[PDB]
Design a protein around this ligand. Sequence first.
Ligand SMILES: Nc1ncnc2c1ncn2[C@@H]1O[C@H](CSCC[C@H](N)C(=O)O)[C@@H](O)[C@H]1O
Lengths: 8, 156
Amino acid sequence: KRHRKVLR
Amino acid sequence: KSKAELQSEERKRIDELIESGKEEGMKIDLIDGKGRGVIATKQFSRGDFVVEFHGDLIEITDAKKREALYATGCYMYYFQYLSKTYCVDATRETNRLGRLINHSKCGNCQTKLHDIDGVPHLILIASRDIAAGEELLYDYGDRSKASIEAHPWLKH
Ligand SMILES: Nc1ncnc2c1ncn2[C@@H]1O[C@H](CSCC[C@H](N)C(=O)O)[C@@H](O)[C@H]1O
């Protein structure tokens, strides 16, 4: 249902 | 100017923008298929500060707690800093615009970690000239099979 944000 | 002098000047510009929280040259629009987005209302030049991704700076234990309760949209930005996981949690509705910016792997902003005297900030820098009227976009960076199955827009 959810996603995230990740610094790359 | 030397490399160091240019870096110093840029840092000063960024620090001062973080402090003022000044968010000029942008506005909210409804973008087909995305909900709200933020669009440029002036040209930005490659390398310009655009906006802070502004919210509640938290560590990993709290970020897990909060995400268990949210699971409400997705406004959490994880990053690594001094060997620990932090999150900028922008779930709470404010007038800050960084939190409303949508995703593209081939966007026009790049997120950078910006340290001010030991406090990490996530900032968006223009990765190319940005036209007036165009949507601001950066890579959210979640490439997980679980996320992309559910949110195929992460693929583009
Ligand atoms: N490229 C994209 N395509 C479709 N939806 C997107 C998108 N980028 C971001 N989003 C949407 O925006 C969410 C992150 S919060 C960003 C602002 C959001 N559009 C809002 O109206 O509040 C995602 O969970 C998804 O709902």
